[PDB]
Amino acid sequence: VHDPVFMRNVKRVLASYKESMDHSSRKGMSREAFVDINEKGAAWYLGHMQLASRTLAEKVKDADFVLEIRDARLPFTTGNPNLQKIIIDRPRLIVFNKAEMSNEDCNRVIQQYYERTGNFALFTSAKRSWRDTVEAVQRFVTHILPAQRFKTTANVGLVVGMPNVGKSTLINSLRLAHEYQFHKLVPVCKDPNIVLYDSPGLTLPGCFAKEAGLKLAACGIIPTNDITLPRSLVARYIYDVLSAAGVGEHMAECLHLPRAPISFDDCISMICEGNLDPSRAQKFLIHDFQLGNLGRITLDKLPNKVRQ
Amino acid sequence: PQLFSIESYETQQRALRNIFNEAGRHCVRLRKDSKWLLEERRAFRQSHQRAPTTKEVSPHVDVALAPVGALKLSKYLSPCSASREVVEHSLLLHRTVTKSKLVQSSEKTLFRCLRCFHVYAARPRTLLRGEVAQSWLEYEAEAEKEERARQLARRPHLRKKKYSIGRQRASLANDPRCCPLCRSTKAQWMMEYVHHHTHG
């Protein structure tokens, strides 16, 4: 037992922490949208992703290949605009996670366009482990990238992806796997000499427009809090996308509705009609859109040039 | 098509902005406190370096009531209506703003408690002091306690006449910070209550 004054002090500070964290109210600003964990520690990046074009170019010039991680629901809006603007000489492998919910037709269209451009699209499901993904990445490296000059050197892949998409989870999984096998970078397979290099700030989007935030909250990337962004702004956009699709009978069959709804108020009242208030009803609708019982959905549009 | 469901949410919110700016013309004049008024005249001379203007200091508090349409709006709106949350939140915000303007007055006003449901006349500043949670209202409370200690420390016998059981009981009845029946600090503006009942 240490000093009693120190015991009293730690008791007092723990009680203060408890009385500070007892409040269930969540603050407006999404801390997750700006925090980004790395090897040095938790970092907060400010600014958009356009003013970092040369900082991205100087690193994609050093890296051997470009491993990007995006979400299949909204491919283009999650990533880097300068990567799509300026052509990257290095081969790119784009892993679309949560591919079970995206439109199969849009998935084949985007993978066809990536094959036409020179990139390789890999769609990963929840049942698939990261081992098959990293094995396919190794196969891509040994099939596309040329042989290194010196035998001891390794090929580097710059990882571009938001921490909500699964980049941080993949990094942690590979790190723990390597640590358990042996007991700023991350080695995956030592026989082909493949290593990965992460860039937190270049992938952290930071600020976003209204519709961008709507799409991110509908996909589950950005958090949702009552002070900053009510559920109405996102659920009405979801229903507007569903109405632009025009599948009213399909909405009814999915939500177990007596008839095809006419308006958003009608949708809310019909979901309310188990009994629950409109707020939790809209929360359950958004949760349905998150879990993905509604399938073959793509919120991000495709430009004319990518559709050609 | 277009953003029908999005524009409908924006249209209803624009209506709430207009019907609440309309209710501003229905006001109830409340004369400010004597000590608080001199505190605004003092802070104005140091800020603007000029004598205070009778139209800027506003010795009469302009409190705004909730619009007559809004109370009957949430009334006939079913709980299953999605548009009830956006108008309920609009009323909860105005219900607190009304408290913020009410605490600046010191004239006698009807205040009922919610514990034993007793209606009594109280002064809004001293009654709603613990609920409003304003630092300037906290700093003036600490300032007046020192001002009383300065007078009592200069003359100890001054406490005998000023602070007596006859004087202390009289001042508590003059500023009923709690209900004389249930002794509860929780209270409500009766004017806002009767405005909500006869319309709902």
């Binding site: 958009h48 439109n103 199969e104 037709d105 600020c207 976003f208 427009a209 209204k210 519709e211 961008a212 507007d240 996308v241 569903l242 632009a244 699709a245 599948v247 399909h250 069959e253 999915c254 019982n293 509604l294 399938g295 073959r296 959905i297 793509t298 919120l299 549009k301 495709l302 | 098509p1 277009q2 953003l3 999005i6």
Partner: peptide, 30 residues
């Protein structure tokens, strides 16, 4: 309900050059 056709047209919403497409920073600066 999983493989049902749900396609979204590009002319219904999210027009190019809109205050919703542009972030609030640029609009406030302008």
């Amino acid at each position: 309900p999983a493989s049902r056709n749900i396609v979204v047209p590009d002319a219904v919403h999210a027009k190019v050059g809109s205050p919703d497409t542009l972030p609030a920073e640029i609009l406030q600066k302008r």
